[PDB]
Amino acid sequence: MTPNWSELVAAADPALVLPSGERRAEVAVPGPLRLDALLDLGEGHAVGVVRSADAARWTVPLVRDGAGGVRRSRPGDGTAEHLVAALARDAAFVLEAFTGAAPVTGERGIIVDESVIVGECAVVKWAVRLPAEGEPGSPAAQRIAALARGGFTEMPRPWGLLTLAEGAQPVLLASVVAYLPGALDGWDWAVDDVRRLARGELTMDQALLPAAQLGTLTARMHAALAARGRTPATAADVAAWGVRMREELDEAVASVPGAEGERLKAWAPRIADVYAELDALAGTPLIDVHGDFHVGQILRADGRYAVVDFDGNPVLPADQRAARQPAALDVVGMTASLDHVGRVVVFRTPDVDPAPVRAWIAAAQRSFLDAYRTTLARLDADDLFDDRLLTPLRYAQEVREYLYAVRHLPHWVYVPDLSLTDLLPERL
Ligand SMILES: [Cl-]
Ligand SMILES: [Cl-]
Ligand SMILES: [Mg+2]
Ligand SMILES: [Mg+2]
Ligand SMILES: [Mg+2]
Ligand SMILES: [Mg+2]
Ligand SMILES: [Mg+2]
């Protein structure tokens, strides 16, 4: 008889677990492989949770093939199709389907960051590397499900989620969401809006509306996420925040060159002064947040806004990205991002008049916060936002931009330099 899935995986080349296939033999995945869990999708298709001999765990879309026995599914094999069908139609797994899932067919691969377009209307995203058993990984499945359950719709419509039932949070193995082919992210559309403002093709009112819509979206998002509950920050939590933020400040002060570096070195005492007041913020509410929130995570098409990318903050250790944080963290991420959009327009656009752009920077931050506060109040969710955190967390956001610059793009130091120039009290 044909072996079971376990015997096929144990006998398969260890490169089975790799999306891009076998690599150089000198650094091959160590075998033998072991199948820890298997969701049978029918007709020779499956989702495996596979362990390599180094204890690393993997999500593997599998297909039985008479050529080699088993191999990793490729776009066009139909495994993503079969996952979608299992949504429309083993205790280790949780398959959650949402309204709108349909058994669409036809697969096309696309390169992101593995993602497979199905029926030219849905996107299946396979997790690849998983955390160790019982350890936290990406919270994207918990975020998307909480949003859908809360009636939040300003995101690609969820079709389904496949998770492994273990640990504090179910481990994400695959997500299926609506495909938005004609959608750009904010680093395209927000820059274009403000550029058009600078050219006089939009009025200030027109160029400010997206900032208000973003504020409403963020408030709707937080209200839905907060329905899963909240956790008061402890004294140790806020103390840890200050240590981390001061260390990042010290690194930026030690690495930023030139005039920007001199001004930052002169500003560091005041920034540190503000970080010091975090000790009085013990008890501030922590909720499930987006955690990596900025205009690049917002798709816009035909006046519809959609937030994506719920894996968490990529600079935190992988096992901390699911942790709850202050809602104000997302708030400052977006308001900082809006400021930066304005800085980029001025820096990149020939013959631009910075006066209207800088007026827009200030007015856009006010438009966002007003809409955010008004929407939270309309949703009776006012108390998740502790605005005492605005200044310390915003400063820390700008310091992160210095570190990005010195590590990846040196000239980018102008963004936090000009942002902080306008943020800091002009009394110093
Ligand atoms: Cl500027
Ligand atoms: Cl730039
Ligand atoms: Mg072989
Ligand atoms: Mg090999
Ligand atoms: Mg080796
Ligand atoms: Mg993103
Ligand atoms: Mg991400």
Numbering used by the authors: 1 to 89, 95 to 118, 122 to 436
Sentences from the paper on this structure:
Here, we identify and characterize a unique GlcN kinase from the soil bacterium Streptacidiphilus jiangxiensis, closely related to Streptomyces spp., the classical antibiotic producers. In contrast, from 20 sugars and 4 aminoglycoside antibiotics tested, SjGlcNK only phosphorylated specifically GlcN and displayed vestigial activity with glucose using ATP as a phosphate donor. Determination of the Michaelis constants (Km) for glucose and GlcN suggested that SjGlcNK is better described as a GlcN kinase (EC 2.7.1.8) with a strong preference for using GlcN (Km = 8 ± 1 mM) over glucose (Km > 100 mM) as the substrate. In addition, the structural and biochemical characterization of SjGlcNK provides new insights into the role of these unique GlcN kinases as the missing link for the incorporation of environmental GlcN to the metabolism of GlcNAc in bacteria, an important intermediate in peptidoglycan biosynthesis, glycolysis, and secondary metabolite production.
